[PDB]
């Protein structure tokens, strides 16, 4: 489970053929204000199956360098990912732009999207759910969800909400053969929900403890309806350091932040992808905790997941083993290139 490197050719501002990485276990992507970093985020999304409409273009061809202003650099472009795994040969996943359409490839054999996605699924990478990705502003959105919105989110990640339409259909079909028909869909939804929820609830205290580095902090997740949790809100109670037990809602500022982070990291600790792309989470952080989150990432990256962070704040990315620095080269169109820098060669 390791993203070893990304290879790009003529994708957005990445003109020519360029290697991105190799990545270490904790790598920060940084650079002065430009399109380079977000184009790299898009390259990662693109190689993992993202739809064109989520890539800030109208047509696939517009992803070829220079294509937006009618000066394409080639008739094709590609992004590939090298995925490494102890005991096994490297597997290369590539998506090529060919004739305005996507061609998917595993180790240079052309495949259809269904097989590309199935193969990524076997590796822990859920391209439709985007389990590997923490989008920008993800912390803020979590911190705003009330108990019922929290239940909505668990129905999504656990895919139990898929069964939510049949649950209601068989509930009307009830009011002897319908008693068994409903109790079966009730049980499928419940086992899906609880398998996810109970993992998150189990892991959340250790995460909340790790983020606010002292052991005095505690966190708890309980359904409102412990029988059918999908039919009610999910309660989230925190004992912030020094303060008494309270609902996460009743928190405030930099501590509600750390509690939403712990819930966010806890949600992802279930069926976790082998790598974790964090797009500018250090943006919603104060000099009161950004260092602690960065230390939490550093600690988790030596064992639990590979961390790839796009970061604006030195107090975050100086904790990385490795920096990928994005810079512009002047040209007709914006051109981006990268540098690699090993930080482990220096003390702190």
């Amino acid at each position: 489970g390791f993203l070893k490197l990304i290879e790009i050719e003529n994708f957005k501002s990445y003109k020519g053929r360029q290697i991105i990485g190799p990545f270490q276990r904790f790598t920060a992507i940084i650079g002065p204000n430009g399109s380079g970093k977000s184009n790299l985020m898009d390259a990662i999304s693109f190689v993992l199956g993202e739809k064109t409409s989520n890539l800030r273009v109208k047509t696939l061809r517009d992803l070829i360098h220079g294509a937006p202003v009618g000066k394409p650099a080639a008739n094709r472009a590609f992004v590939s990912m090298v995925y490494s795994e102890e005991g096994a040969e490297d597997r290369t996943f590539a998506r090529v732009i060919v004739g305005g359409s996507s061609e998917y490839k595993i180790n240079n054999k052309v495949v259809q999207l269904h097989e590309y996605s199935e193969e990524l699924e076997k590796l822990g990478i859920l391209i439709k759910a985007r389990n590997f990705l923490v989008f920008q502003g993800a912390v803020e959105s979590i911190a705003m969800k009330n108990p019922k919105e929290r239940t909505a989110l668990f129905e999504e990640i656990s895919r139990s909400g898929e069964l939510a339409q049949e649950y209601d259909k068989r509930k009307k079909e009830m009011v002897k053969k319908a008693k068994q028909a409903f109790e079966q869909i009730k049980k499928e939804r419940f086992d899906r929900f609880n398998a996810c929820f109970e993992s998150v609830a189990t892991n959340i205290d250790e995460i909340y403890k790790a983020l606010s580095r002292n052991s005095s902090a505690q966190a708890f997740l309980g359904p409102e309806n412990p029988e059918e949790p999908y039919l009610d809100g999910i309660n989230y109670n925190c004992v912030a350091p020094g303060k008494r037990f309270r609902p996460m809602d009743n928190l405030s500022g930099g501590e509600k932040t750390v509690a939403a982070l712990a819930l966010l990291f806890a949600i992802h600790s279930y069926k976790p992808a082998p790598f974790f792309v964090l797009d500018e989470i250090d943006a919603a952080l104060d000099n009161t905790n950004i260092g602690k989150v960065a230390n939490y990432i550093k600690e988790q990256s030596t064992c639990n997941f590979q961390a790839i962070v796009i970061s604006l704040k030195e107090e975050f990315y100086t904790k990385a083993e490795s920096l990928i620095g994005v810079y512009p080269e002047q040209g007709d169109c914006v051109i981006s290139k990268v540098l690699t820098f090993d930080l482990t060669k220096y003390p702190d």
Partner: protein, 60 residues
């Protein structure tokens, strides 16, 4: 003339070394320097760029 990022970082710690690296990126963006890295994680070499015709070690 030229300047090696790795020599610039010799007696630095992590946070100072990152800042020098970051400044290579900034100075390149302003076209104060040109940049060269032979291969990943090799030294990075700064060359004079078009929008600065002073001395190179003045920037550093």
């Amino acid at each position: 003339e030229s300047i090696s990022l790795l020599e610039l970082c010799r007696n630095t710690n992590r946070k100072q070394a990152a800042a020098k690296f970051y400044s290579f990126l900034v100075l390149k963006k302003q076209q104060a320097i040109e940049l060269t890295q032979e291969e990943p994680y090799s030294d990075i070499i700064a060359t004079p760029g078009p929008r600065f015709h002073g001395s190179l070690e003045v920037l550093f």
